[PDB]
Amino acid sequence: LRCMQCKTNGDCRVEECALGQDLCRTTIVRLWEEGEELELVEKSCTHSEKTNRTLSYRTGLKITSLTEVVCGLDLCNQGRSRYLECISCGSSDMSCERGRHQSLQCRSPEEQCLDVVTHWIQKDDRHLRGCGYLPGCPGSNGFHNNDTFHFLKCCNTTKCNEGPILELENLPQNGRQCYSCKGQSTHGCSSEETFLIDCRGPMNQCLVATGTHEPKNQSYMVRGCATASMCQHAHLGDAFSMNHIDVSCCTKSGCNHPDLDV
């Protein structure tokens, strides 16, 4: 495959795609700063399992819109109609902790309402609601260990992303037990530093994830409860702050024991 490759620069070349990269992508962000509308466009060869994906949220009635479009043909990346009503909050200055009633109608018919949360058990939180299209929607997706909580719901009903902020601690145990840890294989995710926890809500599988951090190729590891999906869609994998990410999920309690590693 051949694609256009363009940095947000507007610096462009023809690319001969690497093996495993059989699609070209175009990512556009349109947003509002002061009374100016900005645009960033990025184009390139991307990976096999990737699709069209969408995101937008209220900013000032102005919105921040983000689009990624994918296609499989040579150089195919030469760059009030309103729909589902959704709650929008979490932007620069309208916190979800502060304006959970406040809507935006989605501008694509495919897109659904979003709720995305990151909490650090006892670093700043993040909450975002708005519109988007993601693979494997609608549904609930998430991970938790003893230190972190990530979650993404997408749904296709009017304002269905209304509600208080979703807290881990508000979720029932589901009867699954997984091992939990965060850090290096010798520091944090060492054998006697890993322990069992009770999985809550939809997160009824056991996850281990591997990858890298700064300031080198410092290997990193995370173990916890997860929806199966956390292992299936790189956008969910992106919640973990990890470069060359490798994610595994498995069904039976305790099955993410270090000694069972595959």
């Binding site: 990512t27 962000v29 960033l40 990025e42 994906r53 995101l55 921040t64 983000l66 990624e68 979490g90 932007s91 620069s92 995305v116 990151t118 993040r126 975002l128 988007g132 990530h150 993404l152 790189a234 956008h235 992106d238 919640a239 470069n243």
Partner: peptide, 13 residues
């Protein structure tokens, strides 16, 4: 490194 769409999904205020 970090994908540009992912970032908005997990970091963008």
């Amino acid at each position: 490194k970090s994908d540009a769409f992912x970032x908005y999904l997990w970091s963008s205020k």
